[PDB]
Amino acid sequence: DAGPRGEPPGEEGGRDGIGGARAETQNTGQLSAPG
């Protein structure tokens, strides 16, 4: 339980997410989806 495993919803977050406001300060999703 005490050991490292990262963050599952942050792997998803790195895939097609919008770090900025949806969809204005940032207009489309990032990083790893193929455009």
As a whole number of angstroms, the distance between CA 17 and CA 11 comes to: 10
Residue at token pair 């949806």 = 22
What residue spans of 1-35 are helical by DSSP H? 8-16
As a whole number of angstroms, the distance between CA 7 and CA 27 comes to: 25
As a whole number of angstroms, the distance between CA 16 and CA 29 comes to: 5
Alpha-carbon distances of 13 from 1, 2, 9, 25, 31, rounded to whole Å:
23, 23, 6, 17, 9
> Residue 22 carries which DSSP code?
B
Evaluated on CA atoms 18, 19, 21, 27, the torsion sign reads negative
Residues facing residue 22 across a β-bridge: 26
Encoded amino acid at 11, one letter: E
Q: Which two tokens stand for residue 34?
A: 């193929």
As a whole number of angstroms, the distance between CA 15 and CA 3 comes to: 24
